[PDB]
């Protein structure tokens, strides 16, 4: 249950420190919405560029 | 006189924190940008009744643009030359990176002004911007030359 | 000029779904008939504060029209002869059972028009009505020659 | 101008409750119909020394009209078309059964008006009738197509 | 409890298939509101004609 | 001055479902809302304001923000037998009370501050039945000492 606990710790910390960082890196990008940068290939959980 | 003719026609939206206009929600390039620490209802049912989370590093709300305002909202260019962009409290220009105005622009109740060309192109939004000797600065959110949305901020910025 | 003069005076009410008029709540003969699938608040506190269930077989609401809206609430005759009944998007006449107008009347955002004589007598409320070759039909809700409230539906009916 | 000329000629009688008029004792079709909840004496010795029990289901009194005023008291037809029946505070018309007048008619101190044609025929007497909207109701006491004396009353009628 | 159940079934089904059908047969009638039909004498749970 | 000075003043109606039933008036700092008058208000500096009950007087209070501070209805406590004025006419009375001509309106009126020609609030309407020819005014006012009191004839009016 400790081992089950820490993975749930490592889950939710990974949730925040992915989804926040997935919410970020699109806020700089998906607010300009043209946003010509084909380095979306670092999150691939927040997706769909504009062909550019 | 484009600083008021073109600008009154623009569909900004003030934020009445219990009647108190503390900032202007503006509907920019599709999505809408609220200065987020400014709070309160807004004068559009398309805009008032929507929930929005936080762009907390920039301190803004976000999209929430119903499709009826789509096809006309504040198209723009990400970049800017050192031009005379204009709004209700006058114009602005600066050479390198930033935005500074004549003194007395007003920070309170102002943050939310979009930053429009004479041509009508939103290059940024007001955040703040302390007095710099003779002039008053502008902290903003704007866009990189690459188009990346960034915020340009002098030290000791303003309330909204 | 009774198609616009009289109708503007009538106390119909549009239904803004987040600011979007999708149909007209017309107060007709005592009780009000909101087109039910049309949703949204309405521009009257004595109408938007009005709880109402479904007349779902006909797809209408009801009333509960308070004592400060009634008594000239589009009084009418239940029946209809083949009369030139008029409203905002033009007039109608048909000889047997139905209602059909020239092409391009507009059903979307329109359903809710009470169907008034030049005299000003309701005989129906709009539901829809696909183009039947040349003309645009009208589905409605109306009254029988007996006064029985029925609805009239051609095939492939329109939304509201 | 028959709504005031013909009426003032008629032998209606106000019921002073210690000088305060609360209704009109009118002499209609033989017998007299005093509104019962209206109380007080009357300006006629042929009507003031006259004892009367209750038509409490209708809330009226009755006659017992002396023979001196007999041979001219407000003869009428029991039925009524959608007529513009008229009196002191204006005219009424309704298409089937009820009776509704323009707003501000006044129902206090007035219930007791007989309901006269331009011809001068009583098809009803006032019971009141709440403010309905931009017009106002009339609950009445009137007669069936069969001549049966009835009362017509919308929900939540008025005092007298 | 089965016998108590089915009557509660037969209750609520009778509720809907009376009150819906009592909500109906007045919606055709009490929406025209003159509505001269003295065959209200089939529900007698939704009541009060207009003397006609 | 019975309408010029008053329309310029920052009175505020209380719409109960759109129906005005009284006027919240911003009187020397604290606002004095008639309490039995219910409904929202046409000022959000005033409508988003929680206020407890001065139920012995049947009022609310302030808690008025600072933007409206430095301009609100400065007044005196006492009053001579003056021709104090507002929307529905003027008032004068000699000792203790306030009475106006008939038809001032008690309904939808209680909340008017009671202003001099100079424009000084010595009272606020509470009500006050028709007094034969004239009409009374139940009010809330200030003692000669200054003590905020309510004046009430028998059988006062709704608001």
Automatic annotation (TrEMBL), chains A, E:
Task: Give compartment(s).
Answer: Host cell membrane; Host cytoplasm; Host nucleus; Virion membrane
Where does the chain cross the membrane?
A: 1-19
Please give the function described in this protein's UniProt entry: Provides the signal sequence for the translocation of the precursor of protein E3/E2 to the host endoplasmic reticulum. Furin-cleaved E3 remains associated with spike glycoprotein E1 and mediates pH protection of the latter during the transport via the secretory pathway. After virion release from the host cell, the assembly protein E3 is gradually released in the extracellular space.
Assembly state and interactors?
A: The precursor of protein E3/E2 and E1 form a heterodimer shortly after synthesis.
Query: What name has this protein been given in UniProt?
Result: Structural polyprotein
Fragment boundaries within the full protein? 693 to 744 of 1242
């Amino acid at each position: 249950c400790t081992c089950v606990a820490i993975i749930m710790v490592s889950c939710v910390t990974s949730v925040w420190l992915l989804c926040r960082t997935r919410n970020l890196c699109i806020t700089p990008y998906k607010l300009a919405p043209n946003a010509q940068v084909p380095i979306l290939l670092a999150l691939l959980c927040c997706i769909k560029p504009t062909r550019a | 006189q484009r600083m008021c003719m073109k600008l009154e026609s623009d569909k900004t939206f003030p934020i009445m924190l219990n009647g108190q206009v503390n900032g202007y929600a503006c509907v920019v390039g599709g999505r809408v940008f609220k200065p987020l620490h400014v709070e309160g209802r807004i004068d559009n049912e398309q805009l008032a009744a929507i929930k929005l989370k936080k762009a907390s590093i920039y301190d803004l709300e976000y999209g929430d643009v119903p499709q009826c305002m789509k096809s006309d909202t504040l198209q723009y260019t990400s970049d800017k030359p050192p031009g005379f962009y204009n709004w209700h409290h006058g114009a602005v220009q600066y050479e390198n990176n930033r935005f500074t105005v004549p003194r007395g622009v007003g920070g309170k109740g102002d943050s939310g002004r979009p930053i429009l060309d004479n041509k009508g192109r939103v290059v940024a939004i007001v955040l703040g911007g302390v007095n710099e000797g003779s002039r008053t600065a502008l902290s903003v959110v704007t866009w990189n030359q690459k188009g990346v949305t960034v915020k340009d901020t002098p030290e000791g910025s303003e309330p909204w």
